[PDB]
Structures are given as structure tokens and as C-alpha cells.
Amino acid sequence: CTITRQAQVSEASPISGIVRLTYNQPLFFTSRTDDYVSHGTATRECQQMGYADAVSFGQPVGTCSIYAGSLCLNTRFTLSWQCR
């Protein structure tokens, strides 16, 4: 009902040094993995690339990914980081 986890990575573009992670939310569900695992993954991606010290710099973005009539079965939430 109000339990979700497992926020993973979805994009790592060296051009502009942008890392994007995504996580899922069911219809009547919430999601906040740990507020720190996303930072760790972003830092790992930046280190893998030529940058480092990822910064959140933004706010979560939620766009529906599954449509069932006038509803939203699943919602995708994105976290952006700017490697520096």
C-alpha cells in the first residue's frame, strides 16, 4: 500500500554528464527507496564515467507508463544527477 523500493539506473550520458535513475509505483502505492542508494548509484555511474561527485540538483519526475482506460496502473519516477 505504502511500501516500495528498488530504484535502479536508466541512463548515463557523458555528454553534459547526466545520470538518470528510474523507479516504479503501483496505482495505489508510494515509493522512496532509501534517499541514499540513489546517490550511491549516481556516484558509481559518475566514477565509471570521467566525472564524479554526483549531485541530485533536481526533483523527482513521475510519468505514467501503463494506461488502463481512465487510470494509471504504473507510474515511473525519475531522479536526475549532474556529475561534477
Partner: peptide, 14 residues
């Protein structure tokens, strides 16, 4: 959405 290597912009809107 992102800036490509050649400078092209990936645009998404809704």
C-alpha cells in the same frame, strides 16, 4: 531531454 554528441537536442513534451 538530452544533448547529443553533435549538438542535436532530444525533445519530449506532453
Amino acid at each position: 531531454d538530452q544533448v547529443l554528441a553533435n549538438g542535436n537536442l532530444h525533445v519530449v513534451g506532453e
